[PDB]
């Protein structure tokens, strides 16, 4: 039970935002901006690729992802370097992995350039998904009140 009041959420997502330890499953090109089946099919495909690489001795990249007013950022764990950056306006859909409580993904990109990014979280994926929901809702609300800049 975490506090999700507006004031708390602003302090939560400002600056570097919230960080989560995870592993990158992969990135797949998709045909649309949203869709439950679209995402589950992509997640299943990417995991299949990872499983095939895992049989060859390959492991997923260790990362940490942050959720902030800057959107979703993926950093390499070993070096701390920023590897992927998807702005809030570029993210269209968030989806939990129906078969894995520790995996989720999101669709990003403009029309005709959609990609599904799959993440295996160190702990439960739920808190990450809820943070994204809260972040997007907050930005929508602040924008409607013309106060996003005063809180970002």
């Amino acid at each position: 039970g975490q506090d999700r009041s507006e004031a708390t959420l602003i302090k939560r997502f400002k600056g570097e935002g919230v960080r989560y330890k995870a592993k990158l499953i992969g990135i797949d090109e998709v045909s649309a901006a949203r869709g439950d089946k679209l995402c589950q099919d992509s997640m299943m495909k990417l995991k299949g690729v990872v499983a095939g690489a895992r049989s060859k001795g390959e492991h997923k990249q260790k990362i940490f992802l942050t959720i902030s007013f800057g959107g979703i950022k993926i950093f390499d764990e070993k070096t701390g370097a920023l590897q992927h950056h998807h702005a809030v306006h570029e993210i269209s859909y968030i989806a939990k992995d129906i078969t894995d409580h520790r995996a989720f993904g999101y669709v990003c990109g403009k029309e005709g350039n959609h990609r599904f990014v799959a993440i295996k979280t160190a702990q439960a994926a739920e808190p990450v998904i809820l943070d994204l929901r809260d972040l997007f809702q907050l930005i929508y609300e602040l924008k409607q009140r013309e106060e996003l800049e005063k809180k970002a």
């Binding site: 949203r34 269209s92 859909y93």
Partner: peptide, 10 residues
């Protein structure tokens, strides 16, 4: 699962 209210298609 949910849609991002702030997503911009273009």
């Amino acid at each position: 699962n949910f849609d991002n209210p702030v997503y911009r298609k273009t």
